Structure 1
């Protein structure tokens, strides 16, 4: 049978989502009780440096914030769908604003890792672990939030699989796409936070739309010896960085204005070019694939279109 069989599979996924969810909450909690709360416990003070004590947030990030969310809102809302799993895509959608917390958590994560790398042996932790009777150490839990977002993606991807014809299939997709969005976001953010030497706050130049590596030549008015640069496509600019032999050193910017693009060059479908003025300034960028190139050129069109019409009806002021 069809319907009877699919529905039973959908219910199977809903169980995992809900089983793992509960576990997720429980996990974050034992760490906030088992470790975080303990950094503030007088009785434990003799095992914790006067400084590490402060690093409590650097180490945990907004885990608590995340915990309350999933404990007070999300789980409760996910469970409502126990009888109608096809429509669980509504929750994820309606809370994408709340999910922004994950971006904050990941952003801090690298620093946490630096700190953890520098004091993981510390007696304090060893103790908390005994008391908890944990086979594993704090670091494997600090990783839980990061993963949870992907589990969602996989689960949502699975739900839709057995719901293409159900009411809500629309939301499922949207939700799925959105999660993928958060993931792309988080991933791009990680690269941007590894940019060094950018005199100023690389936030006043719009949101990061794309980042990735390319080979760059400059036909301005070196044989075929390109530089390997990591590009960051923002709303107001395109940053060029060198990947340190992951980290990147800022090289130069390209004000996203008066820009002239060349959607196609002869030589390879992976070349497109960014240039300024009448072309006495030109950048030939080679993407790692003609596909990538497509996207970048495309995302760039959008920006100029946007950058452009960011005056068209904005000049009467």
Structure 2
């Protein structure tokens, strides 16, 4: 039961993460790249700084990682393997976190209410800043879910320990890369 509630959260919060990144790309990013609205010169053509590599992280989760977690739904005690299999892909969270302070500064100093205006228009509960912390949140959150699985999975639990090792290591490497 506990292992089942945890896997179900892993899956449900994964779906919502993908949804949230998707929203972010096809609103806050799409306004800027479209050319349908007045873009402050201070942020113009700096969408790579604002959003960092969030497209690539979205593509990972949307094309692969959510499809593969789904396949571990009835195999919670093995889901650590999923993170080992895709370990190199999570290296892009290092890149994302390195860039987040530069993204925050940029939005503060040079974007005015550009994005506030878009939020209001589209009727979004989440600010662009809310969306843009999500990758940071998500990448620290996986190791919580794995620890929870360790508290309720038996001697078939190297198929978690190694998953966890990886998902402890990605955020530490992101943490260790900041100025």
TM-score by length of 2: 0.95
Q: 1:115 aligns with which of 93, 106, 118?
A: 106
Distance 1:182 1:138 in 2: 24
For the aligned residues, what is the CA RMSD? 1.3
Question: How many matched pairs?
Answer: 179
Q: Distance in 1 between matches of 2:9 and 2:110?
A: 35
Distance 1:144 1:21 in 2: 12
Instruction: Give SS of 1:163's match.
Output: coil
Distance in 1, Cα, partners of 2:162 & 2:13: 22
Distance in 2, Cα, partners of 1:119 & 1:23: 30
Residue of structure 1 equivalent to 2:93:
102
Structure holding more strand per residue:
1
Unaligned runs of 5+ in 2: none
Q: How does 1:168-179 map to 2 (within 5 A)?
A: 169-179=157-167
Structure 1 match to 2:23: 30
- Is the aligned partner of 1:90 residue 2:78? no
Q: Following superposition, which runs of at least 4 residues in structure 1 exceed 3 angstroms of deviation?
A: none
Residue 15 of structure 1: SS of its match in structure 2? Answer: helix
| Native 8 Å contact 1:93 1:171 kept in 2 | no
Residue 51 of structure 1: CA displacement? Answer: 4.6
Deviation at 1:20, TM superposition (A): 0.6
Provide the secondary structure at the position in 1 that maps to 2:126. coil
In 1, the alpha carbon distance for the partners of 2:126 and 2:166 equals 32
Matched, 1:126 2:119: no
Q: Does 1:137 align with 2:130?
A: no
- Aligned-residue offset at 1:58: 0.2
Q: Which residue of 2 aligns with 1:60?
A: 51
Shift of 1:171: 2.1
Query: Where does 1:161-310 land on structure 2 (aligned, <5 Å)?
Result: 161-165=151-155, 167=156, 169-190=157-178, 194=179
Provide the rounded CA distance (Å) in 2 between the counterparts of 1:156 and 1:181. Answer: 13
- Tell me, in whole angstroms, the C-alpha distance in 2 between the residues paired with 1:85 and 1:176: 13
Give distance in 1, aligned partners of 2:109 and 2:52: 17
Q: Distance in 2 between matches of 1:78 and 1:135?
A: 28
More RCO (CA 8 Å, sep 6+)? 2
CA distance in structure 2 between the partners assigned to 1:118 and 1:17 by the alignment: 37
Q: Contact 1:106 / 1:146 at 8 angstroms: preserved in 2?
A: yes
Map of 1:233 onto structure 2: none
SS of equivalent residue, structure 1 residue 150: helix
Unpaired runs of at least 5, structure 1 = 1-7, 195-317
Q: Which residue matches 1:14?
A: 7
Maintained 8 Å contact 2:40/2:111: no
Aligned twin of 1:158: 148
Question: Secondary structure in 2 aligned to 1:83?
Answer: coil
